[PDB]
Subunit: 335 residues, 4 copies
Amino acid sequence: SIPSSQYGFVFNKQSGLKLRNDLPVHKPKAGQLLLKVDAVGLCHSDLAVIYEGLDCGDNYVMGHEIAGTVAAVGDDVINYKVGDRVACVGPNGCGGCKYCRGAIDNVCKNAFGDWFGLGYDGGYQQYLLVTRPRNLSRIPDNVSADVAAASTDAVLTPYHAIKMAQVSPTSNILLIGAGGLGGNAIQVAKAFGAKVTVLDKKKEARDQAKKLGADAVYETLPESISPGSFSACFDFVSVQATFDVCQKYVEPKGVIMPVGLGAPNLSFNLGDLALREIRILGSFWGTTNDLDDVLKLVSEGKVKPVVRSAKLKELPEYIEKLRNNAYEGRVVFNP
Amino acid sequence: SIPSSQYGFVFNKQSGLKLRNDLPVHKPKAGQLLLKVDAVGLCHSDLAVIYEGLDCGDNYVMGHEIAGTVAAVGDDVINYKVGDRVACVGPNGCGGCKYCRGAIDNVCKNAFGDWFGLGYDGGYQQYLLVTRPRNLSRIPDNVSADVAAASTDAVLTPYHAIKMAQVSPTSNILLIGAGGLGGNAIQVAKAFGAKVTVLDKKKEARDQAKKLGADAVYETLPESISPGSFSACFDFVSVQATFDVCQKYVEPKGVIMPVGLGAPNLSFNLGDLALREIRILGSFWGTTNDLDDVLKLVSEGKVKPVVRSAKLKELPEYIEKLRNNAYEGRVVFNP
Amino acid sequence: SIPSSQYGFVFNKQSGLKLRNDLPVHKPKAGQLLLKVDAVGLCHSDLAVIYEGLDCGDNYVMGHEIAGTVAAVGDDVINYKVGDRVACVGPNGCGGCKYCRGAIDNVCKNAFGDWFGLGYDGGYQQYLLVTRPRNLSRIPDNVSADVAAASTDAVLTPYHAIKMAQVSPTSNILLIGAGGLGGNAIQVAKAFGAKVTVLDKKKEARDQAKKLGADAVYETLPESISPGSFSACFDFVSVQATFDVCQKYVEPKGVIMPVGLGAPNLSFNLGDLALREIRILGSFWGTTNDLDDVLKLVSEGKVKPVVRSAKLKELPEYIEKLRNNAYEGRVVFNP
Amino acid sequence: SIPSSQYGFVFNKQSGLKLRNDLPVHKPKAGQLLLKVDAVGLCHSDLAVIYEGLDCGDNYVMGHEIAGTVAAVGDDVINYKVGDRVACVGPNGCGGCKYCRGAIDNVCKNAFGDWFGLGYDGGYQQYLLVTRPRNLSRIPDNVSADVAAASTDAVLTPYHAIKMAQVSPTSNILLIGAGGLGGNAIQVAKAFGAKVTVLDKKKEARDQAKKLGADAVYETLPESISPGSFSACFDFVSVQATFDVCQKYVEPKGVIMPVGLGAPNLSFNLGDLALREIRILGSFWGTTNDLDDVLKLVSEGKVKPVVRSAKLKELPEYIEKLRNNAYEGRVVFNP
Ligand SMILES: O=C(CO)c1ccccc1
Ligand SMILES: O=C(CO)c1ccccc1
Ligand SMILES: O=C(CO)c1ccccc1
Ligand SMILES: O=C(CO)c1ccccc1
Ligand SMILES: [Zn+2]
Ligand SMILES: [Zn+2]
Ligand SMILES: [Zn+2]
Ligand SMILES: [Zn+2]
Ligand SMILES: [Zn+2]
Ligand SMILES: [Zn+2]
Ligand SMILES: [Zn+2]
Ligand SMILES: [Zn+2]
């Protein structure tokens, strides 16, 4: 019993994010599929689109952290049957260019501004039209639709980055910033078997880290901790200051991964980077395969993300709370 | 002016390959695309389907070595416009599973028996329906539709294998069997800058190799050639005998690549393979991206494949010729 | 107080392994180093040298699973000072050829028949002359000299192979044979975060596996377990039968690692290996760096090997016990 | 007939580089080896040590671009016999730490300030004491001692960087600065089969490039050349300006390699680097194995470096010439 009208929050550069009860319910052209949204997360990114003026285009339902159930499938759709529970791979790669075909759909030039809920329609509605089903990840049975939604960015982003760094059980990494996403980072790192050293200014952030399995936690790296000794450094703050710490403490041939949004530019010392073959790798969100891995890990209990439910219509208020960083535990919404 | 009826050679397990003047001309559902076939090759593979009983299913136009021009595109098709010249990526990966999304669409479990002209409809017709456009490679302007067609298997297969082996300019490889596809192998190997040593029983095969740029050519590997000294061995014959030569002459941590069809099983010496960390890697055809690379190489003139044209309807005779190995220079057909 | 005479067990092809109280105590030429043996293990390998006729040369103290303390260092030795506790990297790579310089000293052509206690002098003496100190791994303080000794083969071999397979937390591996070394394999695999499925005929072997953290344990792989679904297969039995199981159950582009000694030759099905890009990688023992990682893991308690001590002179009896497989829990000996 | 006194140019922070006729001729402690210097190059690096104040320590013969012949070998030296012609691997890695054992001896923490002729004694003498023979590369018979010496930095550095970038025949790279070392870079890149686009301000540099095999050469990159289209960018100038060009023109997931010395710091745009997964890899000189590859390539004639001979004693003047960049064609010296 699929309706033909539905409610949802659209975003318009003129009117901001406004609720609407007159939203269509597209039927699946063949190859496409209709997803009944079960849980959709909210993170800081969403706020940059609304307040901070991040241009992703105009007139789209929002929310990229999407989990839902297959409601209707166009003909020709054979990998998904109605009922199948799935998660949305944010970047919504095009699935046909050299980057997607090459295992990096997260950087697809063609899909720019066609990301779920950041160009294309998101999950802040009730029934989402999935133009390209390749960008879906089957949700393991033992995983709630809320937990999955939480993982689409909060866990996927860090997993992608740590995988990029090729962290192993012999790894000795440094994490700067255990608050933002950086919480799940710790669990993900540990799941790889690494020795994780966390660095944070805030006392809660540090306590959390301890409880989460961090091997060492510091306000400031001690003098006993020797320079150029970490195999990989993940800067979640990413400010000239923090990056400098990374380049100081990363070992030869190591990896510095600026995965924060704290400065528009960062500088590195050419002589040091060169002489010690330091590698600075940029990573962004995750691939469709990554999300597959992320759910296998959440399902396996190696990562447990922290989320609290809410009737979708309650969104507006949670956004004002988060706008003033009045909440810092992922919030998923049930439409 | 796209007709609605067309001619082509269908394959039926009951009647073999038979010409038909009553073939439909499917119009592109959105997302699909119609390809006017310009050149379609024929290779031994095709013969195993017809005589040797290789099961790929029933009732499909055949020929997987396909080159043609975009004639009509469904709506939603934005990466290809009418006119665009393209080549068919044989395996026709599904473009939505863990293997396709992960850069190995050539092993897509979902596309089994849906390969162009080996499960799904091939290029032995006039107008092919391309269900998934991801499996197309833009043909460089300076490349004839015949040369492209030649490359879809003859060159693509070896290129994929050699890339898999990570051959470099410092490589020292051994090639066994310069007749079958093995001809293009030599050029491809040289294009990577490797030192190629060819081994063949037939004298023509050897002469060809010389002319093609082989660094050394032998009937039998000389005693002066030291054991365990080749970085990679490509057995194009793949017979217990030839494989034994590879394992004898490949160096520690080297690669033995059984890329022939000469025996259903091959055995290796466990003690030697383990003690010298020998790697046996299986490869098959190529990926969509590989074909992209293959055309950049053919266009760049680093690989010139050998092909002779023919009106498509002339197919039946060429198949009887090849059936008794009466021809050994790729034959493309123009429909 | 370094003596100049010492006891130890030498191996002669004529007299077998015989105790000797007249053994020299070589003083360190510069660059060399003298190691006071603290614990030396015994494994099946040793038996093939003595009974089964494995040729490694003649007249050497035996035992390759070596742990000890630095007793005297030649001049020029700056990385090790007297006192430093170390473990012996079996292969004793040459440290100067393309393989050692290239991170694979375990396959050094130059060091053939110069392996500790399998060509060169081992640890079944009291004071071993370490010709090349590069082949030593500092033993973490919290690790007993017995545990270290245990790890030089028992753990090192499997860790090297698993790392070679690039097992990750998203991995889904299959292990065939949880008795021989295969016990530590399980822990090592788990330390990487993989999902381990074990397969063994013996009931104890299976029970052990369960207790050790195996995710699934079977006598025979169930029919519910789908073919071509494991990322990597480690055959510790390595018999045509077991290898066949691997090739049946390994997924496309997967890894089959014949790490057992059950047959001198094994055969694979060419068509399957090729069509599904299956990779057969041979591995052998471990590198110097591997042992570094192995001790960081043992020290970190991610792997706890099972060993029982014994006065070195008690060796002869333990060898007869093991000769009739009357003992199956690694035995280290203190000289 | 090995003397016991010899001439050479020592460097002292107080007196600069001064000739000396009273230099010892160390006899090889076992494991060591004595090299009769045949050719020793001179490059800008050497000038930073003498004028620009680069601290590498005190009192050492200089010149790191060393080629010579084995004159005496200590006992225990089995890989080299007297007579063997060899080249010096600059970094002189320690051959015993995690970095050297792991294939990156060029970043050895232990060998800091113990580099040939930049901490330890160089080739500006007649007979050099090679403490660690692992850091030697056999010189191919068809390669002059002068050409080898030229290659130890001039060719080795770029080869190491290009290999690090994994340039292939399908690569499309950008080179900024074809004067400094950047000349050999072009040949090296072409030896891998890449499509090389060079960018230089000076007109000679550009003309050279053309003659050297560059595919395209520009004063300023044209507007027809599309942004984010190069697989790898090598900045040999490395100035905020040039780096910016790299980040603008490198494609998604591409490589920017700041291999020049034009600025002490460089900044990158975080948003772009992250959103397009751009990788900035630092490289430095080369490994011992790299030099092995470099000589195989020079011997194979794929790279022909440009050098002019000179009696060693003529050094002082060539240094004043180069000091005012009055010469720009590598100069090797025969002692
Ligand atoms: O949604 C994300 C990544 O989590 C994002 C990050 C950078 C730019 C735009 C959006
Ligand atoms: O068409 C190919 C590869 O060229 C083939 C190879 C093996 C089995 C079936 C088909
Ligand atoms: O000691 C080992 C590996 O554990 C061995 C393995 C194969 C051949 C000779 C010796
Ligand atoms: O000699 C070199 C590399 O060519 C060098 C480069 C950077 C710092 C010190 C020395
Ligand atoms: Zn988000
Ligand atoms: Zn794409
Ligand atoms: Zn074919
Ligand atoms: Zn697929
Ligand atoms: Zn052993
Ligand atoms: Zn070696
Ligand atoms: Zn230099
Ligand atoms: Zn070192």
